[PDB]
Design a protein around this ligand. Structure first.
Ligand SMILES: [Ca+2]
Ligand SMILES: [Ca+2]
Ligand SMILES: [Ca+2]
Ligand SMILES: [Ca+2]
Lengths: 218, 179
């Protein structure tokens, strides 16, 4: 019932603007236990009154689950969001993945990032991962879906550190760090690599140890 | 301004997180223009007896029926909602629910940061009437309801009756956000 959302002045209100004609919507809902519901809706305005028509089709709900057994107790509120700063950080990240600069993360690009962060994953997995957040099912991750995935996100930092520390001596040198950032598709000067080392290097030995790495990475 | 070198570490940290497993549940609704149309991505949590949740997500494309006239399109924004059931009769054949919803600014997007244009057809109080029908796991049903609210404050109440196929052999909650 989208017409009853308080929109601040500075955000255009798609719903209120659509009158007198109104609007429609189509929706696909997936529950984590497998149930799926498709909905189509029309919102119209007739003689000063709002009029809604909805068609729903749900399937695959487990017979023993809480929905079919009527063991539900209402919805949590929906209040989490990202900040403007976070969205701008996540856009910078996204481009590491979006190396063709097109707007979409193909399974090819996800594998190359995972490869240069040292991962060894199949299509069997690169399609599982992409399906966990492919809202619309085209088969790639665009920026809004990347946002959702990010918002939803020790042993793995340890792995990252082992990958950065190519020679295994316990310290990431400038040369090691340049190699990973380059492979990630970062465009940065050698000065900029050193500036990253300097930012991380609290004990001032010219290199990044594990604990220093953890602090930058978390 | 965030320091350049720190931005790099942050984004490297994000890339490591993005490829990692182990996803939380989240409760969020993000709106993003696509076309000339408005898309929403919503993650909600349905409370279950014993205190767990069933996590659910949906993608919605909203389309205007105004075919002539410039509609100002928003960019990316979120909406906070609280939808609460106020009453029910027996076996959930009658349900009263209310919702409070507010869109949230998270940066200049799409249509500038100037709003579209106030629509004199949407007054401070508006009524609604609804018909919803369909099936779940093959069980057919039809509900009707009525309600009202304050569109500029984001508040509304709906009284809904299950007029065919009742009592539903499934939880009414799964229909809550569909009217
Ligand atoms: Ca791409
Ligand atoms: Ca997609
Ligand atoms: Ca080393
Ligand atoms: Ca050091």
């Amino acid at each position: 019932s989208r017409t009853f959302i308080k929109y601040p002045k500075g955000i255009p209100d798609f719903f209120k603007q659509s009158f007198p004609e109104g609007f429609t919507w189509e929706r696909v809902t997936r529950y984590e236990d497998g149930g799926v519901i498709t909905v189509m809706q029309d919102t119209s305005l007739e003689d000063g009154c709002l009029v809604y028509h909805a068609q729903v089709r749900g399937v695959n709900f487990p017979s023993n689950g809480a929905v079919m057994q009527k063991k539900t107790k209402g919805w949590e509120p929906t209040r989490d969001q990202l900040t403007e700063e976070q969205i701008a950080e996540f856009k910078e990240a996204f481009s590491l993945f979006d190396k063709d600069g097109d707007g979409t993360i193909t399974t090819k690009e996800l594998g190359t990032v995972m490869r240069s962060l040292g991962q060894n994953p199949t299509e069997a997995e690169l399609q599982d991962m992409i399906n966990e957040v492919d809202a619309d099912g085209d088969g790639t991750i665009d920026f809004p879906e990347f946002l959702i995935m990010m918002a939803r996100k020790e042993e793995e930092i340890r792995e990252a550190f082992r990958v950065f520390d190519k020679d295994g001596n316990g310290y990431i040198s400038a040369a090691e760090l340049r190699h990973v950032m380059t492979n990630l598709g970062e465009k940065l000067t050698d000065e900029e690599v050193d500036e990253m080392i300097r930012e991380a290097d609290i004990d001032g030995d010219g290199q990044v140890n594990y604990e220093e790495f953890v602090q930058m990475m978390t | 301004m965030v320091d350049s070198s720190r931005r790099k570490w942050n984004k490297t940290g994000h890339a490591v997180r993005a490829i990692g497993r182990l996803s939380s549940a989240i409760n969020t609704e993000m709106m993003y223009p696509a076309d000339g149309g408005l898309r929403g991505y919503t993650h909600m949590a349905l409370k279950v007896d014993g205190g767990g949740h069933l996590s659910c997500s949906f993608v919605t494309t909203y389309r205007s029926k105004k075919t002539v006239g410039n509609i100002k399109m928003p960019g990316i924004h979120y909406v906070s909602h609280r939808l609460e059931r106020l009453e029910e009769s027996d076996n959930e054949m009658f349900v009263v629910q209310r919702e409070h919803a507010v869109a949230k600014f998270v940066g200049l997007g799409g249509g500038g940061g100037t709003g579209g244009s106030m629509n004199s057809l949407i007054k401070e109080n508006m009524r609604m009437k609804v018909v919803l029908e369909g099936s779940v796991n093959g069980h057919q049903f039809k509900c009707t309801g009525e309600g009202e609210g304050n569109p500029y404050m984001g508040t509304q109440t709906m009284r809904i009756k299950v007029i065919e196929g009742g009592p539903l052999p499934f939880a009414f909650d799964i229909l809550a956000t569909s009217f």
